[PDB]
Design an enzyme around this catalytic site. Structure first.
Site, mmCIF file in Angstrom:
data_model
loop_
_atom_site.group_PDB
_atom_site.id
_atom_site.type_symbol
_atom_site.label_atom_id
_atom_site.label_comp_id
_atom_site.label_asym_id
_atom_site.label_seq_id
_atom_site.Cartn_x
_atom_site.Cartn_y
_atom_site.Cartn_z
ATOM 1 N N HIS A 199 127.831 -46.220 -19.338
ATOM 2 C CA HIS A 199 128.111 -44.780 -20.027
ATOM 3 C C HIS A 199 127.505 -45.154 -21.359
ATOM 4 C CE1 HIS A 199 131.779 -47.404 -19.691
ATOM 5 N NE2 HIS A 199 132.142 -46.941 -21.045
ATOM 6 N N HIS A 219 127.695 -44.109 -25.121
ATOM 7 C CA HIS A 219 128.739 -43.373 -26.133
ATOM 8 C C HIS A 219 127.695 -42.531 -27.337
ATOM 9 C CE1 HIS A 219 132.446 -45.653 -25.683
ATOM 10 N NE2 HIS A 219 131.391 -46.565 -25.158
HETATM 11 NA NA NA Z 1 132.229 -48.709 -23.252
#
Ligand code: NA
Ligand code: NA
Ligand code: NA
Ligand code: NA
Ligand SMILES: [Zn+2]
Ligand SMILES: [Zn+2]
Lengths: 157, 157
Positions: B119, B121
């Site tokens: 993922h 950010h």
């Molecule tokens: Na993370």
């Protein structure tokens, strides 16, 4: 928002290049005018150790083509810059025997950017570092959170 | 280095997918089994607000195809995931009126990874945040720095 308006304006923010940006240390490194501690280079990208070594092996990966930061990139610029990053990161981790790695791109001064040619940090992490990211947490108000997501969706569309 | 060895081993680290990873919250979100505060979706990528909101508009961008983190990605996986990021980041900045933005990918536990589906950010920054990255600096020993770069080059080649 930041002012726009240039004879070299880019559709995605910032300026298109009409050979290199002047007064740009990273362009001078790409041009070979100023030396760097190189770890990887190809037609599109250059990676060198960050001289300040936030941790052992801290590396910057930059595009050879000048762009200010990721906020101003095209999808092609972003795809080209990051395609190389896994391979470089794996090598860095192997060479340093790092336990983990942070990949970081900072955009504009409030996020810490001081050199205005896009650069992605690869920061090896060792179970020891004085390096750290302070990820504070809050409890969500789901109604406000849903409205914020709606607002952001509006801007994408 | 971390152990390898699976009937589903990937050339670039980790496992190839032989439909989704079990016990993966992000795969369950991609599958639509668990709800998320969505801001963007296409064939390859999903972005949703991080419920902990390190800052206002904190968003995660994930590939729909499971991979552990960027250390284990192919160039194609990395190119596809990040191609969308500038457009999402621009929208986030517009919606929140942010002054800057950090883009961060954390790989393995020592770098802060706790959910093992890659993922990225997007952390909007406001001239105000309790969010911060501690980039310590050191003076280089240029001889050691040159040898470290040589060592890393060896691993890329
Ligand atoms: Na993370
Ligand atoms: Na641009
Ligand atoms: Na930076
Ligand atoms: Na892999
Ligand atoms: Zn430049
Ligand atoms: Zn997953």
């Amino acid at each position: 928002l930041v002012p726009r308006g240039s004879h070299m304006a880019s559709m995605t923010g910032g300026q298109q290049m009409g050979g290199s940006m002047n007064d740009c240390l990273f362009c001078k490194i790409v041009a070979g005018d100023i030396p760097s501690s190189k770890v990887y280079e190809d037609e599109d990208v250059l990676a060198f150790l960050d001289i300040s070594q936030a941790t052992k092996g801290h590396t910057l990966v930059i595009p050879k083509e000048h762009v200010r930061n990721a906020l101003e990139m095209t999808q092609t610029q972003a795809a080209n810059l990051f395609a190389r990053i896994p391979k470089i990161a794996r090598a860095l981790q192997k060479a340093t025997k790092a336990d983990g790695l942070n990949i970081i791109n900072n955009n504009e001064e409030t996020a810490g950017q001081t050199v205005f040619h896009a650069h992605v940090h690869l920061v090896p992490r060792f179970a020891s570092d004085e390096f750290d990211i302070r990820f504070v947490q809050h409890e969500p108000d789901f109604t406000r959170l849903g409205q914020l997501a709606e607002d952001i969706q509006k801007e994408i569309e």
